[PDB]
Design an enzyme around this catalytic site. Structure first.
Site, PDB file in Angstrom:
ATOM      1  N   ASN A  77       0.790  -1.222   0.000  1.00  0.00           N
ATOM      2  CA  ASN A  77       0.000   0.000   0.000  1.00  0.00           C
ATOM      3  C   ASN A  77       0.826   1.278   0.000  1.00  0.00           C
ATOM      4  OD1 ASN A  77      -2.325  -1.636   0.197  1.00  0.00           O
ATOM      5  ND2 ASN A  77      -2.324  -1.524   2.442  1.00  0.00           N
ATOM      6  N   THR A 114      14.095 -14.752 -31.028  1.00  0.00           N
ATOM      7  CA  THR A 114      12.642 -14.827 -31.063  1.00  0.00           C
ATOM      8  C   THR A 114      12.158 -15.032 -32.492  1.00  0.00           C
ATOM      9  OG1 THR A 114      12.621 -13.238 -29.226  1.00  0.00           O
ATOM     10  CG2 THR A 114      10.521 -13.744 -30.280  1.00  0.00           C
ATOM     11  N   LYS A 162       9.847 -14.375 -35.486  1.00  0.00           N
ATOM     12  CA  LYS A 162       9.064 -13.252 -35.970  1.00  0.00           C
ATOM     13  C   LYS A 162       8.396 -13.616 -37.291  1.00  0.00           C
ATOM     14  CE  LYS A 162      10.605 -10.670 -32.631  1.00  0.00           C
ATOM     15  NZ  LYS A 162       9.777 -10.550 -31.403  1.00  0.00           N
ATOM     16  N   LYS A 210       5.843 -11.577 -34.557  1.00  0.00           N
ATOM     17  CA  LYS A 210       5.410 -11.978 -33.221  1.00  0.00           C
ATOM     18  C   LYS A 210       4.220 -12.925 -33.297  1.00  0.00           C
ATOM     19  CE  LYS A 210       5.335  -8.735 -30.016  1.00  0.00           C
ATOM     20  NZ  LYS A 210       6.586  -8.970 -29.238  1.00  0.00           N
ATOM     21  N   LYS A 223      12.813 -19.109 -29.518  1.00  0.00           N
ATOM     22  CA  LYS A 223      11.737 -18.952 -28.515  1.00  0.00           C
ATOM     23  C   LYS A 223      10.405 -18.403 -29.059  1.00  0.00           C
ATOM     24  CE  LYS A 223      12.049 -15.401 -25.647  1.00  0.00           C
ATOM     25  NZ  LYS A 223      10.844 -14.748 -26.111  1.00  0.00           N
ATOM     26  N   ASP A 261       7.434 -15.753 -28.872  1.00  0.00           N
ATOM     27  CA  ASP A 261       7.288 -14.403 -28.344  1.00  0.00           C
ATOM     28  C   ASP A 261       6.492 -14.455 -27.045  1.00  0.00           C
ATOM     29  OD1 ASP A 261       7.999 -11.582 -28.891  1.00  0.00           O
ATOM     30  OD2 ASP A 261       7.649 -12.083 -30.987  1.00  0.00           O
ATOM     31  N   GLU A 262       6.725 -13.461 -26.189  1.00  0.00           N
ATOM     32  CA  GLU A 262       6.044 -13.426 -24.900  1.00  0.00           C
ATOM     33  C   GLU A 262       4.526 -13.444 -25.056  1.00  0.00           C
ATOM     34  OE1 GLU A 262       7.941 -10.705 -26.079  1.00  0.00           O
ATOM     35  OE2 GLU A 262       6.049  -9.881 -26.843  1.00  0.00           O
ATOM     36  N   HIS A 291      10.646 -14.808 -18.992  1.00  0.00           N
ATOM     37  CA  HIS A 291      10.502 -13.540 -19.694  1.00  0.00           C
ATOM     38  C   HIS A 291       9.907 -12.507 -18.742  1.00  0.00           C
ATOM     39  CE1 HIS A 291       9.033 -10.541 -22.578  1.00  0.00           C
ATOM     40  NE2 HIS A 291       9.870 -11.069 -23.453  1.00  0.00           N
ATOM     41  N   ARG A 292      10.457 -11.291 -18.775  1.00  0.00           N
ATOM     42  CA  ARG A 292      10.107 -10.243 -17.822  1.00  0.00           C
ATOM     43  C   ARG A 292       9.060  -9.275 -18.366  1.00  0.00           C
ATOM     44  NH1 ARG A 292      15.420  -6.133 -17.634  1.00  0.00           N
ATOM     45  NH2 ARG A 292      15.369  -5.541 -19.846  1.00  0.00           N
ATOM     46  N   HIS A 334      15.725 -12.349 -18.688  1.00  0.00           N
ATOM     47  CA  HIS A 334      16.159 -11.212 -19.488  1.00  0.00           C
ATOM     48  C   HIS A 334      16.676 -10.101 -18.583  1.00  0.00           C
ATOM     49  CE1 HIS A 334      14.097 -12.295 -23.471  1.00  0.00           C
ATOM     50  NE2 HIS A 334      13.834 -13.296 -22.651  1.00  0.00           N
ATOM     51  N   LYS A 354      17.307  -1.709 -28.627  1.00  0.00           N
ATOM     52  CA  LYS A 354      16.141  -0.845 -28.777  1.00  0.00           C
ATOM     53  C   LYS A 354      15.444  -0.538 -27.458  1.00  0.00           C
ATOM     54  CE  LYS A 354      13.006  -4.728 -29.671  1.00  0.00           C
ATOM     55  NZ  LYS A 354      12.185  -5.466 -30.667  1.00  0.00           N
ATOM     56  N   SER A 404      18.508  -9.306 -25.094  1.00  0.00           N
ATOM     57  CA  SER A 404      17.610  -9.411 -26.235  1.00  0.00           C
ATOM     58  C   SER A 404      16.972  -8.062 -26.527  1.00  0.00           C
ATOM     59  CB  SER A 404      16.512 -10.451 -25.969  1.00  0.00           C
ATOM     60  OG  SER A 404      15.588 -10.521 -27.041  1.00  0.00           O
TER      61      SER A 404
END
Ligand code: CAP
Ligand code: CAP
Ligand code: CAP
Ligand code: MG
Ligand code: MG
Ligand code: MG
Lengths: 448, 91, 450, 448
Positions: free
Chosen positions: C104, C154, C156, C158, C182, C184-185, C275-276, C308, C315, C360
């Protein structure tokens, strides 16, 4: 009902009693508190391990104490023989045996020291126990190894090796001639070496060594854990991985959990090695405790496929004569009483399978004539330091130990006197085995 | 060196083999300092003194009990008759 | 008992308190409401994250608040140090830590902004957590790969690929030199690519790539789903098909379900990629939220095999010095405090297994010198667009990235300064690797600040 | 296939696109990096939350990106509207929504700050979600309480009370007039107060207060734990003890585990209180994060029976107009867009049950007129400190709070202006309620 305190011997000493074939008999070596007569001490032990307490109770009249009470029926010096009716014991429970026979009587003020030397298990009670799941003969068939002692050894250092390095030592030992290897009793699951990791790495090493030698191999994976459920989980996983063996510390884990694991081991097709860690806490001293021969009877009843018995000549204590009697109790169908070996009763084993004796602790190549002379073919010889401590490492050490055992076995079968000619037998073998020559040189001065 | 939450593991190291060495004729473990970081992997009692007194509703005195005697030989029915007399009488 | 409102400072500010080795410690950066002194704001955070509320209560006298309260024991500028007794926390529950520490206190009117910068986890509390199921060293043995960073990427686009076309991309990447690939998330199970189909097609692609290259391979199959039961079901299926890995979005799925999946992964023998996703929602801004280094500690406590950590040069935002500190928190047995990297406390890891850092996001061949310099060998470098965006396609892109990493590693082991000689090391390799030469030509002018 | 980097705007910005009824819509407030045009920054969010990455890939030709890509279809100042096709999302998975919409887009160098303000959940996607298992109307029938806001309160101190003392505070609160009480969000299971002890002690207190007052009572037992399995175990035990409620911190536990707990709760017949611990870590700042109204929509989709919504007037931050919108989102069948309250889209709820708002945090009797005016009858008002902080304890404090709420509801139903006459309404009730008088005097100077 006459209230008040009465001497124990009034009701629980009966030297006219003739033991029945269904009675359970115990031999107690008693050291009374000075001033307490031997008959009162023996009666107290009998009373407080069966039906009595320290004062008369009105409820005695609601039961037939003549039917259920234990009785000291013979006293030979400081040895008391006590008989227990068959009905006093729960079928198939070693735990119950312990709770009566060694429950409270070792802590009475009137008895200064007390040691349980032997125990006659009656056939009618033995039939409620399963005994070993595999047994010597079936184990030799599963391994395809006959006519000699079997070779083993504990991986060292006891603790601290990663699972990867731990399994590399396993491979080197088995590749070099050992039939088996084992986890140390205190290697369970720890931050430096978790059990799942160890089990996976090790079985890969076992399969590799087995493929390359062409001989069957095994590793005694320790499932000892803090709870029964966790031990069973670790046994299930070892079986999934195709292991021939598991290992349990039956005394530190305890007899109730031990029985659970033994049942599950048979259901999974696993052979069961039993380490006796903690035994010396109560079987070492001659005046107080429980002699190991009693523990070895309980082990065979629950059903281990092996149990450690001592080496006599190694780094840990063990009497030659007592060890010879313990070996017979583990392997024979019937063991006659023998005062020269400390066997106080005849022991019929009622068709239960035999247990492999296991000799381990501070032994090396120079001991092999003695060990073959003591145990014969039906035993495991374990070389831990005696393998990895070889000047050239575990693989060379395993070869030296395997060649030594076979040289002494061949000599015995030829009829030679393996003790009188011990060194000569090892020297002939060393002429065609450089690794054995180097082992003899390194440890020629190490004696206990 | 120790497996979390396992008394069995403690025994296997501390009292496993060191009591049977020829070089040491007798040996007694007198005490043991369990560190806090290891204690936290153990649950401890399920009830505890204070919760138990609440469940019994008994405070401010020792509690009274007693072992049924004779140790063995009583039928289940007679065993429970002794129990009833003891508890009815103040235990 | 005296009812009424008292300042938080009177009970929860104690500048004389000496932290215990069993205390859990936090470093908070506080932006008080104008007019509220720093000491009062710090004490409010300590109070409302442990034992206190906004007014005195008669029931304070039914307990020993001296034993259980948290205390702010030091203030330096806008940084407040707070100590929490060990007994305030439930053994083995990250969920409980968050419920107290970040429950809180971030929404009080008196505290206009709040950021948790670091946290000291005591050894006595760490021992109640299992850590990673596999760990860096076991994982390298399972893969039979040593002495270099590991390569990944990853798939692609996605979303939108069919399961069949998805596996074709996987095959090209692994066949071309990547160690792993992998999901994609955000690829879970959707109408255009259902999870059962993807797992089946993909594992077939992985086996073919392993047989043709002679190298062990893996794919990080995303089991993330709307409920714990569904995630576990998907993990069971991945193990049945022989996958070495599964993948979970530990923040969007949440820590409670993450713990359940980590337990089942160990039981199934699966390695667990983490994965974060969502982290930047609250770890980006310097004035409010939770710095990622705290999330990384919690991650290692619950037990992921990789997480990660950012690229610094790609990027997505990330600070070099902070990342170096985070990498040590994931891999080392003990990490000393270091103000230059934002490590406010020493952190002992109590024998827990280490975690693979994963870099990544928007990286390509020109970044490899920097990536090797930052992370060393024990890390994954992932090239998604940097692989499929190659002029000749995914297989060529994978070859270009693999060769780049092995050349920079070689030059480093030969004693060269890979940052000062980065271009030269890459140009040398290009003369014997057409795929790398063309990758260098394509992305040579694509740069992100740092 | 043309290799190389292209601006995100080329594919992911389409100001001519008309949103479909099946599209999921987002309203993002974007703060670009200096020098990045707004259209590129919005295109980057659309691209990296749907189908795109940082460079062109050959595999784009294997897919119909026109069918699946997200599109920024409108920009109003620093607010970008983005539409996502229905087929991008997994049915019934809030987790999947988060992994796309807020997965990575908040951490891009090109976008210095990003806030998700609102989300239009389309009816075709809502039908894959179950919503609350109980709902306001069924809950009121189960409690048999109508025509007023319901009373609750957090037990204090937050931590440190033994299970026995904890249930004593609970008993006084319920006996005094509170309908419910609750564990603090951070009270789970700790060395000073283990969850089994607490569940047993508290339920005894609940039944005791229920019998003495003749009104139905409940306590929100916290099942929040470190793993899904443990939370389900604790929910089972609460149900076994006959509890009406359980409580979960749905954000700290996480949405996947939250869904598991919600399913089991319905199977067990439990009503599910949801605490929003951690929400302010991402919904507090106006330049970056996720607005709570988005979390409130996701909460109703999974299916909590209550959720905290803030007080506006208490110790924790909350805007009045935004709070009024969030309550409609939680309770009404259809909520039309309203710029004055931050509602960017119309929201049809497709028949899902409504959620109880819960106002809590630093409120006392003087706040009751404002709370009734803001929320109406269908809400809980929780008084933690405002109950136990009473000069005469928790029972007295609970009486003052219960009397205040009913005095205000009574004045409203008579046509009085509860805000203009708030003080007079409370003073009139205090003349006959000494507990209320003492509370009014104690906290009259406490304002936020
Ligand atoms: O832990 C040890 O010391 C051993 O591994 C021996 O290692 P070395 O082979 O290196 O001596 C065995 O467990 C003991 O022999 C057990 O004693 P016993 O057989 O008497 O129970
Ligand atoms: O979804 C993506 O953008 C990625 O697949 C990268 O694709 P490219 O390889 O094509 O850039 C990764 O999930 C991000 O790097 C995660 O960000 P972080 O690693 O910072 O959590
Ligand atoms: O821990 C606390 O502070 C409370 O118990 C309030 O106690 P008091 O009743 O003593 O203030 C509640 O959890 C907060 O109100 C939650 O905030 P929100 O409702 O905004 O999520
Ligand atoms: Mg050993
Ligand atoms: Mg991704
Ligand atoms: Mg609370």
């Amino acid at each position: 009902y006459e209230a008040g305190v009465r001497p124990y011997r009034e009701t629980y000493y009966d030297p006219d009693y003739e033991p029945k074939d269904t009675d359970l008999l115990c031999a107690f070596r008693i050291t009374p508190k000075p001033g307490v007569p031997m008959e009162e001490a023996a009666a107290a032990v009998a009373a407080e391990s069966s039906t009595g307490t320290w004062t008369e109770v009105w409820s005695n009249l609601l039961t037939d104490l003549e039917r259920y009470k234990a009785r000291c029926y013979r006293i030979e010096g400081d040895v008391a023989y006590i008989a227990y009716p068959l009905d006093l014991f729960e079928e198939g429970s070693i735990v119950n045996i312990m709770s009566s026979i060694v429950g409270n009587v070792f802590g009475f003020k009137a008895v200064q020291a007390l040691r349980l030397e032997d125990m006659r298990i009656p056939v009618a009670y033995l039939k409620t126990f399963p005994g070993p799941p595999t047994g010597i003969q079936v184990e030799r068939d599963r391994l395809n190894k006959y006519g000699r002692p079997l070779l083993g050894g504990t991986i060292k250092p006891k603790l601290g090796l990663s699972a990867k390095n731990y399994a590399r030592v396993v491979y080197e030992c088995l590749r070099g001639g050992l039939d088996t290897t084992k986890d140390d009793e205190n290697l369970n699951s720890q931050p430096f070496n978790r059990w799942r990791d160890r089990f996976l790495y090790v079985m890969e090493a076992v399969r590799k060594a087995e493929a390359e030698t062409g001989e069957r191999k095994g590793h005694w994976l320790n499932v000892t854990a803090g709870s029964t459920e966790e031990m069973l989980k670790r046994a299930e996983f070892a079986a999934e991985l195709g292991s021939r063996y598991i290992m349990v510390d039956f005394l530190t884990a305890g007899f109730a959990a031990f029985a659970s694991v033994r049942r599950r081991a048979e259901e999974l097709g696993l052979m069961l090695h039993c380490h006796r860690a903690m035994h010396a806490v109560f079987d070492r001293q001659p005046n107080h405790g429980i002699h190991f021969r009693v523990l070895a009877k309980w082990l065979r009843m629950v059903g281990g496929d092996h149990v450690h018995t001592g080496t006599v000549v190694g780094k840990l204590e063990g009497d030659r004569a007592e060890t010879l009697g313990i070996a017979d109790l583990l392997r024979e169908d019937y063991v006659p009483a023998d005062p020269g070996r400390g066997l106080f009763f005849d022991q019929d084993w009622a068709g239960l399978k035999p247990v492999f004796p296991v000799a381990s602790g501070g032994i090396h190549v120079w001991h092999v004539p003695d060990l073959v002379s003591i145990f014969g073919d039906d035993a495991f010889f374990l070389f831990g330091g005696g393998t990895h401590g070889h000047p050239r490492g575990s693989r060379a050490g395993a070869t030296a130990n395997r060649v030594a055992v076979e040289a002494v076995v061949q000599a015995r079968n030829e009829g030679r006197d393996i003790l009188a000619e011990g060194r000569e037998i090892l020297e002939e073998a060393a002429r065609s085995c450089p690794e054995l020559r180097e082992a003899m040189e390194l440890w020629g001065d190490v004696k206990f």
